Amino acid sequence: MLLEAIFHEAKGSYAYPISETQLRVRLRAKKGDVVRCEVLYADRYASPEEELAHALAGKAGSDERFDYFEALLECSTKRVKYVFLLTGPQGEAVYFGETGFSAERSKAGVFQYAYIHRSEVFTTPEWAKEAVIYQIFPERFANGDPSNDPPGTEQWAKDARPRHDSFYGGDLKGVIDRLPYLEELGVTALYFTPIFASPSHHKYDTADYLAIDPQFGDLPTFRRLVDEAHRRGIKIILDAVFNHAGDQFFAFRDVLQKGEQSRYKDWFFIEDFPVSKTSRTNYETFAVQVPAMPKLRTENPEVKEYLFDVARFWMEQGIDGWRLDVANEVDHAFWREFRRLVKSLNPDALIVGAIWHDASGWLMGDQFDSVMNYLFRESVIRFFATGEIHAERFDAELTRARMLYPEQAAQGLWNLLDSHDTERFLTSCGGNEAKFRLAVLFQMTYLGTPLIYYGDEIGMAGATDPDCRRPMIWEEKEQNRGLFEFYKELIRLRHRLASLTRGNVRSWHADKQANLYAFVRTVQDQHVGVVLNNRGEKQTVLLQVPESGGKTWLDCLTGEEVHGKQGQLKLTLRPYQGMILWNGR
Amino acid sequence: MLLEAIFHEAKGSYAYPISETQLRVRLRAKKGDVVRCEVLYADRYASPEEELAHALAGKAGSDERFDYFEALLECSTKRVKYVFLLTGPQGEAVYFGETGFSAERSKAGVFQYAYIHRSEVFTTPEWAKEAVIYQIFPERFANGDPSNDPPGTEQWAKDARPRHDSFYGGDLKGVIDRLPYLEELGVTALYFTPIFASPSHHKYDTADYLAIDPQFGDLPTFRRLVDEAHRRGIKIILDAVFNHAGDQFFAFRDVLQKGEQSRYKDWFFIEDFPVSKTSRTNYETFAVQVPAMPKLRTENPEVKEYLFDVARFWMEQGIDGWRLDVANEVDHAFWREFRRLVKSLNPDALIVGAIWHDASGWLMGDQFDSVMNYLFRESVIRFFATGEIHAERFDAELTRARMLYPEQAAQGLWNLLDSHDTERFLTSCGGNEAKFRLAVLFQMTYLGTPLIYYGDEIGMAGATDPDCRRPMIWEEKEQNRGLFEFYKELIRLRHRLASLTRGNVRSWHADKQANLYAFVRTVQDQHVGVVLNNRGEKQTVLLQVPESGGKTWLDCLTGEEVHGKQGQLKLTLRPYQGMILWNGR
Numbered sequence A, B: 001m002l003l004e005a006i007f008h009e010a011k012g013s014y015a016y017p018i019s020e021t022q023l024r025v026r027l028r029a030k031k032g033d034v035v036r037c038e039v040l041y042a043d044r045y046a047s048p049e050e051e052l053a054h055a056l057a058g059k060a061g062s063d064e065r066f067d068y069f070e071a072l073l074e075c076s077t078k079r080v081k082y083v084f085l086l087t088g089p090q091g092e093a094v095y096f097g098e099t100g101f102s103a104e105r106s107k108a109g110v111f112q113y114a115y116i117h118r119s120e121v122f123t124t125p126e127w128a129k130e131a132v133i134y135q136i137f138p139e140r141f142a143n144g145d146p147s148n149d150p151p152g153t154e155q156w157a158k159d160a161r162p163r164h165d166s167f168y169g170g171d172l173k174g175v176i177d178r179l180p181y182l183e184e185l186g187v188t189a190l191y192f193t194p195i196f197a198s199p200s201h202h203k204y205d206t207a208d209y210l211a212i213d214p215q216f217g218d219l220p221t222f223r224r225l226v227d228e229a230h231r232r233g234i235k236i237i238l239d240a241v242f243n244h245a246g247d248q249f250f251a252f253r254d255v256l257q258k259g260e261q262s263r264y265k266d267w268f269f270i271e272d273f274p275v276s277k278t279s280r281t282n283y284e285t286f287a288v289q290v291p292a293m294p295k296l297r298t299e300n301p302e303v304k305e306y307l308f309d310v311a312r313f314w315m316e317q318g319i320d321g322w323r324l325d326v327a328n329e330v331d332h333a334f335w336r337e338f339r340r341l342v343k344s345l346n347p348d349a350l351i352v353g354a355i356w357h358d359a360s361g362w363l364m365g366d367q368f369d370s371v372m373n374y375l376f377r378e379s380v381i382r383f384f385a386t387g388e389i390h391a392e393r394f395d396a397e398l399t400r401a402r403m404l405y406p407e408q409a410a411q412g413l414w415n416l417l418d419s420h421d422t423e424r425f426l427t428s429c430g431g432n433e434a435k436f437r438l439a440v441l442f443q444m445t446y447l448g449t450p451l452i453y454y455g456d457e458i459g460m461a462g463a464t465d466p467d468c469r470r471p472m473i474w475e476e477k478e479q480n481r482g483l484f485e486f487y488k489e490l491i492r493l494r495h496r497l498a499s500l501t502r503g504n505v506r507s508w509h510a511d512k513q514a515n516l517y518a519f520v521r522t523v524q525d526q527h528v529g530v531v532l533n534n535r536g537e538k539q540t541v542l543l544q545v546p547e548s549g550g551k552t553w554l555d556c557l558t559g560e561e562v563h564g565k566q567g568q569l570k571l572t573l574r575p576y577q578g579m580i581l582w583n584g585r
């Protein structure tokens, strides 16, 4: 067994409390060397002469290089010391604990989880566990009052291909008008890109953080929205740009005019004094040459409490959660006090983050509830749209990703197909709607949160910025009603089959040749299976049972396939068919 | 190269700012697998036209199974994305990064440290980095004035063997009368175990957290000690137990007497109503049957502030530093708002934890500055006292422990050789003053802060609680002043030799058989190498020269070793000799 490959930390994504009294320890080994891992543990003071309690660590997934095992250690005493007895394939047993490896128990040492306090059990809003979000880019979703329109609006048409700045006017009233659509699809929260008052077509140059931008609406319209949507099941989540300010911020203007005398001077990172906002962008901004975005000093206790009052206004207004823009470039202490502030104004206001590098520093329990799952985006483009990885690599990428984070985070990362910065996922499959559908049949059953972009329930293609941002096609003859009844089908299925939302994922079948991949999602007795054929030709496959039991297994999209031959469930599936097979339990 | 053994993270101990412009990055690798390690880096938002800057990661030492590479990335924009070019023994060029491993750069991805903040550069009290702390267990240091006493006391001579009941007097005025000793020895801080009012001889069931124990002193004798010591550059660091409270304590009294009526019911977890002092003792405890100490539920806002009010108060008294006992079972929120407090009251207040399992989750820079280094306590017990580990395992335990936490946390850890509950180091050393002297030459040059116990300067031998709490031996005639002048000289070297306090430690020779281990301390051109023949015989060893250079070294304990024979430096050293060779620059 090569022991420099076995890994565990008593911190972090490898040990964490699911409850006061229940601890979760995970361990990884090179693919194949550990064939049995079993935790032996006791309270942190229990005297030697006692036999230990025991709990077997299951295999929870194997990515490309490592096999990942996971066990559940009851700690009634809310304190736990433990060692792993690891067992090889050729039978070698070893013991792993803090001292190192040994084959003689004690000299392994012992790992320890100091105390488990309920304030450190990572707790995320129960609602977000079964949600499906709908990303609204408000400017392109609908224009419901023509009076707000910026001058020069282009005509709304399925014709449109935009340019960078080009406005189409789309506004909070429009959304208010189209809420009886959103509601039928079965969405449960809308996530607006930034709506606040700002100079450009995209509101990232924030000018006043405390008011809806002039082209979108006004606080009573935002309330009428918050209120009309909540009453329809839908929550409202806002985009929070606290990293950097815009050029028309008060404090950026005060430093601009007064310079060194303004009581705002230290709010921003200063070499360009006086402010040259036109010729030398060297004053800490977004990145070295953007001259209209200077960074707010989140460290400063005035800056901090301003953005906390920004955060409280918007929550007086009724919102259920923020998505945090460029979260990773504002300090952890801000994000902690932020979590403290938010979660007290609203027990269920979610705080979700955007960082596109490993985000575990924030998914520890104390800063955000989940981040945007970029790794699912990469995996789904490649497997489903470009073809470039095969089900084995699919499984590897999937599997390496979910063990990034505590399961409280993983189970609710926002699983996005595309965004207002990417080419649109139908362009990604180059127009092929069988690929697109399979990628959605995946999205709606995997672990985390379906995030639909505006437009894809009805078929919109596009390139990256600005071409994803074409107006939404709202005429029922111009919309792929085929797709819509599928999103509504799947969405319904996500909402009744408790395991799809709240259940764990285990890999069932990964066949690089035929390109099928199939998973099970499980809560208690229930098992649903998702068999996905990523082939444009039709395949039988044979597969083995899920552990417990199922002689008979319904298909929820279509009817019975009780083919459980005592261990072989045999199933044919036509091109790009996914099947979602439910225990019946 | 086993790829499963390569580790790096962009958090924690494996990457962290040393300044806002500079990020230390560390990488762990199976021993022997990797020969050159190098970090190639650019700013996060840098475009691909640019060459990546290069930075070579030297071998920072190798523990039993792993080598460790460590590099320094000058990141001017405070943002860094980095790919490692690993280079191995046959010549395999591997690229490591977040995406994974590939022989092509782009398929490896890049790790990211998003932005580096002044608030997140771990800062430590600058005195503490040179300090030599003197451990007093007050009750036995000396007796000042017998109006302290608690009727029962026993005699002040060498002969007297403490039983667990006893009191020998021992009080803060003795320590005042004793400071010119402390000033002569050369210590720079004094850390007193608990002195707060309590009903027992272990004051850890602190009964009155706001007042010194009757038997020890009063607030002006304390506050006179604090002054009289500042005058001699000796600082008071004090043991605080915020984990459990005492039975007799004010806020608890109110449920001994008040049942549910008790406002203070929620400061405490209470299993079994009421206080079962006598019936059976299970109620949230330090341990399994320990009877006076129920858990201070620090999580509670109304507790927390009290335990912050204690700390305001003892800091109004002018104390410099807390050592916080059984720290590991109180919440990271307590610790972290406590650190903000202490450091805002006094920017220089040392804050030191006591965890006896890996404590990295408090050694980030938001929580404490160091723990008690129990590894040092056991790694010297083996190499020096017991003879049960040779030079190559001493080197390995040392390196496996000094790569565990960020560097700032590692140069202030308390290097104790014994405590009031352990055996006295001469008694482990077997009484051999020659073995002991060598383990002190080491503690005084090793990375960390030297903790002297009261009495080891004078050769006090002793055993577990009680024998190690024996009175100090104050008669010149019964003191090993031969030891006292040796400790006195090392504490002087450490304070004149920059690298002994603030440099880094690279092992120079570790030879299993000869049992001679040797190391180098370094800051800028200055190198100071300590050669230790830990073998009872006189060997001659030939060391290879260190990186800046040194054709000629002076030995600080005795005179000139110009043995620099074209790289080789020949040293003939006597039994149990440690040399301290200062490279002259």
Ligand SMILES: OC[C@H]1O[C@@H]2O[C@H]3[C@H](O)[C@@H](O)[C@@H](O[C@H]4[C@H](O)[C@@H](O)[C@@H](O[C@H]5[C@H](O)[C@@H](O)[C@@H](O[C@H]6[C@H](O)[C@@H](O)[C@@H](O[C@H]7[C@H](O)[C@@H](O)[C@@H](O[C@H]8[C@H](O)[C@@H](O)[C@@H](O[C@H]1[C@H](O)[C@H]2O)O[C@@H]8CO)O[C@@H]7CO)O[C@@H]6CO)O[C@@H]5CO)O[C@@H]4CO)O[C@@H]3CO
Residues within 6 Å of the ligand: A044, A045, A046, A047, B202, B204, B205, B287, B289, B290, B326, B356, B421, B465
């Ligand atoms: O006031 C309490 C006490 O707090 C401090 O103790 C800290 C100590 O300084 C640190 O070193 C550390 O302790 C950890 C220790 O290092 C580890 O080795 C391990 O401890 C285990 C023991 O090694 C193991 O032997 C066993 O314990 C059983 C004992 O063997 C057995 O003798 C008996 O224990 C009783 C003692 O005999 C008795 O004397 C008593 O202790 C009183 C002390 O004498 C007195 O000085 C004082 O101690 C302070 C101490 O000065 C601080 O350093 O009060 C004590 C109580 O009034 O009581 C013991 C019964 O509880 O029974 C035990 C168990 O049946 O197992 C342990 C656990 O595996 O882990 C230690 C825990 O971290 O940290 C502690 C603070 O946590």
Ligand SMILES: OC[C@H]1O[C@@H]2O[C@H]3[C@H](O)[C@@H](O)[C@@H](O[C@H]4[C@H](O)[C@@H](O)[C@@H](O[C@H]5[C@H](O)[C@@H](O)[C@@H](O[C@H]6[C@H](O)[C@@H](O)[C@@H](O[C@H]7[C@H](O)[C@@H](O)[C@@H](O[C@H]8[C@H](O)[C@@H](O)[C@@H](O[C@H]1[C@H](O)[C@H]2O)O[C@@H]8CO)O[C@@H]7CO)O[C@@H]6CO)O[C@@H]5CO)O[C@@H]4CO)O[C@@H]3CO
Residues within 6 Å of the ligand: A202, A204, A286, A287, A290, A326, A354, A356, A421, A465, B044, B045, B046, B047
């Ligand atoms: O206002 C800024 C911006 O904020 C938001 O963007 C956030 C986004 O949601 C996060 O995902 C993230 O960004 C990371 C990004 O996702 C990664 O892809 C990577 O990005 C790299 C690109 O993949 C790579 O192609 C290249 O980028 C070069 C471009 O190819 C090149 O064209 C040029 O980019 C210019 C744009 O073309 C131009 O349109 C303009 O961008 C403006 C947008 O059009 C406008 O919508 C808005 O942008 C918001 C965005 O909507 C939010 O979602 O403002 C933009 C600026 O005014 O100007 C660009 C300037 O050159 O140059 C780039 C090289 O810089 O490289 C990148 C990086 O290597 O990594 C990203 C960082 O990890 O964070 C952003 C917020 O920071």
